[PDB]
Amino acid sequence: XIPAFVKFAYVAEREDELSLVKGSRVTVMEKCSDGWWRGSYNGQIGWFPSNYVLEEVD
Amino acid sequence: XIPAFVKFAYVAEREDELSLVKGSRVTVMEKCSDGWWRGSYNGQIGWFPSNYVLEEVD
Amino acid sequence: XIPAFVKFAYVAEREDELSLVKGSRVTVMEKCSDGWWRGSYNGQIGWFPSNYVLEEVD
Amino acid sequence: XIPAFVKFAYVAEREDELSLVKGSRVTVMEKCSDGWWRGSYNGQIGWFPSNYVLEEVD
Ligand SMILES: [Zn+2]
Ligand SMILES: [Zn+2]
Ligand SMILES: [Zn+2]
Ligand SMILES: [Zn+2]
Ligand SMILES: [Zn+2]
Ligand SMILES: [Zn+2]
Ligand SMILES: [Zn+2]
Ligand SMILES: [Zn+2]
Ligand SMILES: [Zn+2]
Ligand SMILES: [Zn+2]
Numbered sequence: 681x682i683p684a685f686v687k688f689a690y691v692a693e694r695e696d697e698l699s700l701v702k703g704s705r706v707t708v709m710e711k712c713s714d715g716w717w718r719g720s721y722n723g724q725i726g727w728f729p730s731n732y733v734l735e736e737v738d
Numbered sequence: 739x740i741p742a743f744v745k746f747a748y749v750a751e752r753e754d755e756l757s758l759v760k761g762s763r764v765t766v767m768e769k770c771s772d773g774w775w776r777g778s779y780n781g782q783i784g785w786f787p788s789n790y791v792l793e794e795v796d
Numbered sequence: 797x798i799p800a801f802v803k804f805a806y807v808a809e810r811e812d813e814l815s816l817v818k819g820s821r822v823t824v825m826e827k828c829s830d831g832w833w834r835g836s837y838n839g840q841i842g843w844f845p846s847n848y849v850l851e852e853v854d
Numbered sequence: 855x856i857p858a859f860v861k862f863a864y865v866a867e868r869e870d871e872l873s874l875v876k877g878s879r880v881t882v883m884e885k886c887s888d889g890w891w892r893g894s895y896n897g898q899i900g901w902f903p904s905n906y907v908l909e910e911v912d
Contacts, residue, residue, distance in 0.1 A: 694810065695830070696870065710869075712770045714811070718869075723897065752868070753826075753834075753888070754812065772869070781839065828886045 682708040684719070684733040698726035706733060740766045742777065742791040756784025764791065798824040800835070800849040814842035822849060856882045858893065858907040872900025880907065 683705050690700035698721060700706065709725075710718040717730045741763055748758035756779060758764065767783075768776040775788045799821050806816035814837060816822065825841075826834040833846045857879055864874035872895060874880065883899075884892040891904045 710770060710772050713768050725899075783841075826886060826888050829884050 683736045684708050684717075685736060686732060687734055688732045690728055690732045692726065692728075694727075696726050698724055698728045700728055700732050705736075708733075708735070741794045742766050742775075743794065744790060745792055746790045748786055748790045750784060750786075752785075754785055756782055756786045758786055758790055766791075766793070799852045800824050800833075801852060802848060803850055804848045806844055806848045808842065808844075810843075812842050814840055814844045816844055816848050821852075824849075824851070857910045858882050858891075859910065860906060861908055862906045864902055864906045866900060866902075868901075870901055872898055872902045874902055874906055882907075882909070 686700040686702055686704045686706060688700070689702045692699040698706070698719060700721070704721060706719040706721045708717050708719040711730070715730045716727050717733070718725070718727050744758040744760050744762045744764060747760045750757040756764070756777060759779070762779060764777040764779045766775050766777040769788070773788050774785050775791070776783070776785050802816040802818055802820045802822060804816070805818045808815040814822070814835060816837070820837060822835040822837045824833050824835040827846070831846045832843050833849070834841070834843050860874040860876050860878045860880060863876045866873040872880070872893060875895070878895060880893040880895045882891050882893040885904070889904050890901050891907070892899070892901050
């Protein structure tokens, strides 16, 4: 599975979305061609807009 | 928007799924990395598993 | 199935939501305890917040 | 939040579904008029069909 870093804060707006905390690491489980990604953070799973994060370049 | 052709029949199992008629042409609007695609057929819009279809860009 | 009248305009904000036009009639197919309802209007199906509509009293 | 007890085992068939262990207690957070309920069990959150469970308010 694929890690990404939160560049911008995101407050979940629907119950199946994941709130993103600026500076944290999320695990991306799934990508959609429309730019919504599904991932996990701190025991929570859900959808977020991909342009709030940047995939880790290791 | 992209055409795909139905190889195997698929009965919608959830309310947001599209039933696929064998041999028919569907318009794929969206693709997700877990193999679910979203498309339309004869007025209807829904998700379906991509291993039941075959993409065209021929 | 159960008709309702749109009291307030709603512009769909996710792809599985239904835009509501002020004054139109929607068919409600499903209600959720959190207040999201699923219905159809003019060949479109999707979710909307129930407090934008009023169930028809006939 | 409301307890329900699992009568029949259920294997999650979609990524947003909850697997139900027979005999276990789940917390139902939400109910939809088509018979899908959303609940939690041992850290996990997901949808499941309500005819596999039995509500308590005893
Ligand atoms: Zn927004
Ligand atoms: Zn999408
Ligand atoms: Zn790194
Ligand atoms: Zn199936
Ligand atoms: Zn998926
Ligand atoms: Zn809103
Ligand atoms: Zn809900
Ligand atoms: Zn009337
Ligand atoms: Zn099933
Ligand atoms: Zn439903």
